[PDB]
Each structure stands twice: as structure tokens, then as C-alpha cells.
Amino acid sequence: GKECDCSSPENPCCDAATCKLRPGAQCGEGLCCEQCKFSRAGKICRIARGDWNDDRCTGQSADCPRNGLYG
């Protein structure tokens, strides 16, 4: 797919050359990324703007998906 897994070219978790994870880290930068690995689904990645449901990570991705009341 793309060739840049991270957005920061100064991040050690993702090779600046291929902007991708150099080591065996499941993620270089992101909200669901913990210890450079895929945390777990239903992970709090953000808060709800109002009062419905908090943000929960997929656990298999590094970026947190929108699980609030918008989309």
C-alpha cells in the first residue's frame, strides 16, 4: 500500500527513508500505538465531545477510529 507508516520523519520507530516501521514494531506513531505495537481494541484513544460514548481503538490499527456519535 502506501510507503509511509508514520508521519514524523524524526521517529525512530519508523524508518525515515521508507517512513515505515523499521523494526518489528506494529506501529511507529499513532493513538492505539503503545510500545510501538498494536494495543488492544476498545482502547481509550480520545474522549466524546458531549456525553455519549468515549473513543475506543480497534486494537489492530495504530490510528484510533471514530466511535463517538459522528461519522
- The amino acid sitting at 50 is G
CATH number at residue 28: 4.10.70.10
CA atoms within a 13 Å half-sphere pointing along the CA-CB vector of 29: 14
What is the count of structural domains for the chain? 1
Contacts of 28 (CB under 8 A, 6+ apart): 5, 6, 8, 11, 13, 14, 20, 21, 36, 62
H or E segment to which residue 21 belongs: strand 20-21
Q: For the chain, what's the residue count?
A: 71
Backbone angles phi, psi at 66, to 5 degrees: -80, 105
Pairwise CA distance, residues 32 & 41, whole Å: 8
Method used to solve the structure: NMR
Give the closest residue to 71 by CA, choosing from 44, 43, 49.
49
For residue 65, give its domain range. 1-71
